[PDB]
Amino acid sequence: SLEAIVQNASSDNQGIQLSAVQAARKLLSSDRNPPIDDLIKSGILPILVHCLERDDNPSLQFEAAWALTNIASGTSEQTQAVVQSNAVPLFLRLLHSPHQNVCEQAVWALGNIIGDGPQCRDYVISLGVVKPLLSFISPSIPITFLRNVTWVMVNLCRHKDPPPPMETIQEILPALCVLIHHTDVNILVDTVWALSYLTDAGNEQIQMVIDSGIVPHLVPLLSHQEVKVQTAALRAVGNIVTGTDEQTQVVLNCDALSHFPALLTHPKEKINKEAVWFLSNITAGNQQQVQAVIDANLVPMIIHLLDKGDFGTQKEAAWAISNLTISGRKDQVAYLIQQNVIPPFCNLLTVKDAQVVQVVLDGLSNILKMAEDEAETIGNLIEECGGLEKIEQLQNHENEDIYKLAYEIIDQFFSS
């Protein structure tokens, strides 16, 4: 029974105690549906926490840390039960053990605890987990231990409400700079997911990432053979290019667009979608960045995805086309007109999603305004593909801005 297990776990006979702790561990580590609540209610937590102190018996420490790791792998309530037992300070002490397995199990437990939430993460941070954790990174470390370390780093970087403290980001970025040159796929995926979480927390963290000097080694991963590495790298660089024009220009100066012909033609629709999202954030920039997209010969593929892509990729493609008008010259919009953007761009006006219809109407109106000399021919083009009927039906729409823009467009460029 569990009662006997706890009582024996409190025994002064080392054999009885170790056997009890091992029985608990086995109860918590044999199946994917362990009995965590039963063990918590039994009162075993403080006993395991005490066992964490037994530096004389590395096996007892390892077994107790294993049990606590598996209790902390459940719901937030069970992880917080482990936290309330004062386990985190003793795990942080164990991080300095001379025994590799004990260190690794402490890292594992701390990773499960940090991943619960940002306040738990910040409690573990305030106690100084980051320096010991990152001190494990080395060539001599076993690859599985290093993967656990990188998983803990990822958990440290997730949650952006609040985001990790600035000092912690400054400590973690050099470790990521080191790890982004690793060959193991799992370490690369963890490193790049950590970078994606860090770059999704505002422009200041993006500038920190840029200053670390890691982007030149992040952009090449867009062409990695493993699709997980590609997805993570694309997320990270997309986040970066959601920033200012200068950060986007850093990304571009890393030769990023050269990687996108393979991303736009990728068989995975989600990769096409993320790539078109990146490109839409590129087209929302200055004239030279729009011209870089044009020179990379990516516009035809963007229009093809607008025409024949899944709805998400079509959303991002519509956003890219409409962003090009923000700062694009009339020459650069004429290039779009020559590439037959009007028909597939207008075919989106019937989608139920109101945001897409609004974006497409905005883009059409801006296109008609820019090309004053060719306004009539572009209106004829819009009418040949059945876009005029769509725009006129949109006069009966629910949203206010939608029918407002519809009436404005019809009056200005379809009456005259």
Partner: peptide, 8 residues
């Protein structure tokens, strides 16, 4: 986010 250590 969370990992259970299953006896390998």
């Amino acid at each position: 986010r969370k990992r259970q250590k299953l006896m390998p």
